[PDB]
Amino acid sequence: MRECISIHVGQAGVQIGNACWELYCLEHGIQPDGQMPSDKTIGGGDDSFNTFFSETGAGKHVPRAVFVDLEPTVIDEVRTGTYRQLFHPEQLITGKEDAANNYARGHYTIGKEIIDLVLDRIRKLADQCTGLQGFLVFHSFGGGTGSGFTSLLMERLSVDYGKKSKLEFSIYPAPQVSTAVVEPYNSILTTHTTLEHSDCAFMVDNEAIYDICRRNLDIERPTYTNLNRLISQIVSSITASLRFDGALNVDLTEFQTNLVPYPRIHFPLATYAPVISAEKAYHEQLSVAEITNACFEPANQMVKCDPRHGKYMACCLLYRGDVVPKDVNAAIATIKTKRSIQFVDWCPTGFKVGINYQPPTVVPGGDLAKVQRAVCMLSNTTAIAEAWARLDHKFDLMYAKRAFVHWYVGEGMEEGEFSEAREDMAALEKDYEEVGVDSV
Amino acid sequence: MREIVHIQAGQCGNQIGAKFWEVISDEHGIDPTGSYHGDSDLQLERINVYYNEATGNKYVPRAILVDLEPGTMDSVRSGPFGQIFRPDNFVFGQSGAGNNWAKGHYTEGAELVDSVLDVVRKESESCDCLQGFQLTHSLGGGTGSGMGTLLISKIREEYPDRIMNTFSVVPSPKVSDTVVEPYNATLSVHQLVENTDETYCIDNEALYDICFRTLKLTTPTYGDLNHLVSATMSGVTTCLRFPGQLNADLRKLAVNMVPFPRLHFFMPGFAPLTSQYRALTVPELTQQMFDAKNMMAACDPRHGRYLTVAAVFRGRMSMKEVDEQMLNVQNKNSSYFVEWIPNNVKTAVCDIPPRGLKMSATFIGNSTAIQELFKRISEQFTAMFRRKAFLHWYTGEGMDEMEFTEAESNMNDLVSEYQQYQDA
Numbered sequence: 094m095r096e097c098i099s100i101h102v103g104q105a106g107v108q109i110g111n112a113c114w115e116l117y118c119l120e121h122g123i124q125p126d127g128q129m130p131s132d133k134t135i136g137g138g139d140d141s142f143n144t145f146f147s148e149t150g151a152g153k154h155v156p157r158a159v160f161v162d163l164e165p166t167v168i169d170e171v172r173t174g175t176y177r178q179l180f181h182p183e184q185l186i187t188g189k190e191d192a193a194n195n196y197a198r199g200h201y202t203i204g205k206e207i208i209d210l211v212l213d214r215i216r217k218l219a220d221q222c223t224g225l226q227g228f229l230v231f232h233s234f235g236g237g238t239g240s241g242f243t244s245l246l247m248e249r250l251s252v253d254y255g256k257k258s259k260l261e262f263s264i265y266p267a268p269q270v271s272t273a274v275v276e277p278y279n280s281i282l283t284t285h286t287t288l289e290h291s292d293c294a295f296m297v298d299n300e301a302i303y304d305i306c307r308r309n310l311d312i313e314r315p316t317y318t319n320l321n322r323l324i325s326q327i328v329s330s331i332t333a334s335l336r337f338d339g340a341l342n343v344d345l346t347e348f349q350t351n352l353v354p355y356p357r358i359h360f361p362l363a364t365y366a367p368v369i370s371a372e373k374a375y376h377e378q379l380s381v382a383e384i385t386n387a388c389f390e391p392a393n394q395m396v397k398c399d400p401r402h403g404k405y406m407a408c409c410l411l412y413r414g415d416v417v418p419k420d421v422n423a424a425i426a427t428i429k430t431k432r433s434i435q436f437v438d439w440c441p442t443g444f445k446v447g448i449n450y451q452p453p454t455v456v457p458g459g460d461l462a463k464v465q466r467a468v469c470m471l472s473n474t475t476a477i478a479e480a481w482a483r484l485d486h487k488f489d490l491m492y493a494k495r496a497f498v499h500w501y502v503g504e505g506m507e508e509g510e511f512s513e514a515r516e517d518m519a520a521l522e523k524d525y526e527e528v529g530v531d532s533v
Numbered sequence: 534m535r536e537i538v539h540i541q542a543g544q545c546g547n548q549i550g551a552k553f554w555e556v557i558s559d560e561h562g563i564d565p566t567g568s569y570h571g572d573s574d575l576q577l578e579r580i581n582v583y584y585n586e587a588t589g590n591k592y593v594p595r596a597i598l599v600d601l602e603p604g605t606m607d608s609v610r611s612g613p614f615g616q617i618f619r620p621d622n623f624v625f626g627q628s629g630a631g632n633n634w635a636k637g638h639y640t641e642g643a644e645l646v647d648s649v650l651d652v653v654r655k656e657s658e659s660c661d662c663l664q665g666f667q668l669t670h671s672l673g674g675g676t677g678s679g680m681g682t683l684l685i686s687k688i689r690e691e692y693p694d695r696i697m698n699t700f701s702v703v704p705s706p707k708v709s710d711t712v713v714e715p716y717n718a719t720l721s722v723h724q725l726v727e728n729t730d731e732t733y734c735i736d737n738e739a740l741y742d743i744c745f746r747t748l749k750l751t752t753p754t755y756g757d758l759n760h761l762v763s764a765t766m767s768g769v770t771t772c773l774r775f776p777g778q779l780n781a782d783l784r785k786l787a788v789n790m791v792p793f794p795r796l797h798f799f800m801p802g803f804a805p806l807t808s809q810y811r812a813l814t815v816p817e818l819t820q821q822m823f824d825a826k827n828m829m830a831a832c833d834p835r836h837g838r839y840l841t842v843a844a845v846f847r848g849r850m851s852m853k854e855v856d857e858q859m860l861n862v863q864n865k866n867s868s869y870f871v872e873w874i875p876n877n878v879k880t881a882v883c884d885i886p887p888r889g890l891k892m893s894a895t896f897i898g899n900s901t902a903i904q905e906l907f908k909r910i911s912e913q914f915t916a917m918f919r920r921k922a923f924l925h926w927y928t929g930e931g932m933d934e935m936e937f938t939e940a941e942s943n944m945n946d947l948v949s950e951y952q953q954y955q956d957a
């Protein structure tokens with residue numbers, strides 16, 4: 094038990110789920126039809142991979158997951174594609190008309206027509222569980238479904254499942270990849286209405302994933318497939334602790350004890366290494382010391398900010414592959430002297446370490462080189478408030494003129510909901526400022 | 534008074550407890566399945582202190598295994614001496630304690646505590662004359678810290694006149710699972726002050742430094758820390774487990790070691806430190822066991838004064854030379870033993886030595902320097918508490934900030950109380 098149900102909402106979520114679940118199957122030796130040759134307990138089992146996969150009596154390993162989108166085009170590619178056999182048809186849910194980059198349509202208008210059906214389908218997965226731990230929610234900040242329907246869902250799950258944990262993987266918008274003019278509005282609106290209901294949320298700046306693919310994989314104009322295949326490795330590093338046996342494996346809830354000092358301060362900075370092309374990795378083995386040092390190079394962050402001009406409240410290192418305690422300890426000692434790591438005066442300055450032995454895999458015909466070891470750092474830095482700042486400014490520029498606000502008011506929202514949300518964001522920026530201040 | 538009932542709570546509790554049973558079963562010639570395959574009659578003469586005799590002359594430990602998740606207790610069953618523990622005495626919940634005192638003491642653990650006490654009663658009922666209880670646990674986590682201290686309160690309610698010992702692994706940033714440990718430790722310490730007669734302070738800071746500096750282990754596991762603990766645990770319990778003439782019980786120790794009831798926090802030591810070919814002379818054992826380097830609680834005993842000491846030499850040696858050596862350190866460093874308690878060092882000798890060594894020495898000290906350990910955790914606590922940091926984890930389980938301010942203050946009084954007699 095300790096089961097974990099994944100919900101993928103809107104295109105971004107759905108497409109990142111395809112990446113994530115493809116990757117999980119390659120990590121656990123699961124085939125596209127769902128069969129696991131290495132699994133000897135037919136029909137059920139109490140294994141670590143069973144946290145993400147249930148088993149049928151026939152031996153099909155089925156993701157504990159739901160895919161929702163308010164229009165069929167993106168989910169229809171799952172329904173006809175390589176892993177169509179992996180999912181039961183009722184895990185894949187669609188409407189006919191999308192939310193049209195409108196939080197109002199995703200949360201209310203189109204959203205209220207399908208919410209009950211979704212919760213009914215989540216509930217059928219929950220009843221397969223003997224000891225449900227919580228939910229992982231994959232969505233974009235920018236989209237109408239990704240913002241609006243997610244918020245609606247998060248509120249409703251808080252009702253049906255009380256305080257049972259809910260983690261987010263949020264895709265923070267950036268103009269390099271597709272963006273719309275109103276994504277700042279949707280971003281602030283969903284971040285406000287979800288903040289009470291999310292226990293921990295890993296933001297992913299598309300610009301950050303864009304720059305990394307360009308710089309490190311030498312990809313000229315990265316596609317969503319490029320970005321999602323990188324993202325899913327970061328998602329896999331965080332969830333690896335839940336899916337694998339391990340002597341030196343720290344569970345993801347134990348890291349969360351350290352990562353969340355107050356409930357609103359639940360936004361960790363993910364940083365991953367190595368991201369390297371097959372061309373460059375040839376005759377080039379990257380040690381524990383090298384990949385650990387890369388975690389403090391801010392060009393490897395999932396979110397663009399500067400931790401060096403902020404303050405740490407937590408530092409966690411999630412190694413996978415050929416790693417042992419000794420080297421990690423040497424590597425951290427090196428870093429402590431040579432690098433710009435200031436903690437707040439109220440937190441202890443240790444680094445919390447976990448290690449999985451199962452080494453990191455890659456998607457066949459991918460861009461990432463196969464490496465022997467890897468690491469995902471999860472830090473709680475005040476610097477991440479910079480992401481809220483950049484987004485809050487864009488919100489303010491349009492809201493000053495009420496630009497596009499009629500599309501939201503047309504679908505039933507009030508102007509009060511914008512200012513209410515924005516003031517919550519103003520408070521959140523002030524909270525991240527207050528925690529950094531020294532005590533008296 | 535012969536029988537002791539043992540309980541082991543949480544990950545650390547069950548981990549060190551397992552090793553305690555591995556170590557002492559070997560010294561009593563009891564193999565992994567529970568049969569006796571020894572040689573001496575001295576191995577069996579006080580076997581009834583820690584073991585029940587079963588059908589087909591099997592010896593089963595008087596041991597109860599407690600945890601709020603099945604992880605650790607599954608490993609104990611799979612581990613080398615797992616097949617000896619009574620399977621009924623494995624009492625486990627499923628949801629875990631999240632390194633949260635509140636979960637262990639008030640919510641998750643509350644649900645399981647009655648089912649634990651039924652087995653405690655089951656093991657007590659078939660004790661000819663129950664003398665007391667001993668608990669292995671940690672104060673840093675959730676189950677061992679929270680539920681451990683809850684069970685201690687329940688056991689006291691039901692058996693208010695028996696002795697309650699603890700072997701309590703005090704936490705440290707050098708060997709840390711989570712930032713919230715000082716909260717958990719401080720809430721537990723307040724419990725222990727009320728509801729235990731003796732508490733052996735095993736400090737992880739100390740065990741690391743001993744593993745690192747004085748054993749040359751560069752990267753020490755918890756396994757290396759637990760070797761030191763299970764040796765120490767065998768050492769203090771030697772005189773209960775073996776004969777004789779000058780033989781012992783828990784209550785007489787508790788009486789003679791504890792001048793004031795709240796001050797019952799002992800500072801263990803062991804010599805020589807192992808993980809050898811030259812056996813040590815008696816003057817070396819005496820020097821080493823009294824050395825700060827050999828202490829299991831990271832306090833400098835020169836920074837306070839001993840109220841009482843108890844020393845247990847193991848091996849075939851000159852009892853003349855032991856007396857002479859023990860009188861040497863007392864008469865040459867008399868400023869560090871309180872004058873107002875006469876003859877406050879008691880020595881015992883035991884002929885049977887532990888596995889590996891020809892002669893060893895275990896040291897039990899009730900020093901006023903132990904205040905330093907509580908001052909260390911009291912500082913770590915306030916750095917966080919003054920900003921209410923990480924409190925949401927506890928207040929979500931129904932706890933109040935008032936309860937934290939109490940537990941802080943109780944431990945600051947304990948430190949004042951220890952300081953009082955360091956000057957007198």
Ligand SMILES: Nc1nc2c(ncn2[C@@H]2O[C@H](COP(=O)(O)OP(=O)(O)OP(=O)(O)O)[C@@H](O)[C@H]2O)c(=O)[nH]1
Nearest residue numbers: 103104105108191192193194233235236237238239
């Ligand atoms: N990383 C990543 N970002 C994506 C992907 N698809 C969309 N996005 C981003 O998500 C935002 C747009 O939201 P979508 O998720 O496409 O929209 P939706 O949730 O389907 O909402 P509607 O279509 O309006 O109902 C933009 O910021 C895009 O850059 C993807 O596959 N990967």
Ligand SMILES: Nc1nc2c(ncn2[C@@H]2O[C@H](COP(=O)(O)OP(=O)(O)O)[C@@H](O)[C@H]2O)c(=O)[nH]1
Nearest residue numbers: 543544545548671673674675676677704708755
């Ligand atoms: N000496 C020692 N300390 C441990 C061991 N396991 C955990 N600890 C310490 O105990 C504290 C965590 O408690 P733990 O037993 O994991 O939590 P619980 O299972 O909920 O009681 C931390 O201070 C750890 O350093 C062990 O095997 N040996």
Ligand SMILES: CCOc1ccc(-c2cn(C)nc2-c2cc(OC)c(OC)c(OC)c2)cc1
Nearest residue numbers: 772781782785786789841842843844877879881
């Ligand atoms: C400060 C004096 O401390 C003492 C004096 C005597 C005793 C004692 C009396 N009896 C009958 N048994 C003990 C005793 C002594 C021990 O130390 C060698 C023990 O080992 C820890 C012991 O084990 C329970 C009993 C105790 C303390």
Ligand SMILES: [Ca+2]
Nearest residue numbers: 132134137138
């Ligand atoms: Ca199975």
Ligand SMILES: [Ca+2]
Nearest residue numbers: 628640641644
């Ligand atoms: Ca319950």
Ligand SMILES: [Mg+2]
Nearest residue numbers: 103104164191
């Ligand atoms: Mg869409």
Ligand SMILES: [Mg+2]
Nearest residue numbers: 544632674710
């Ligand atoms: Mg633990």
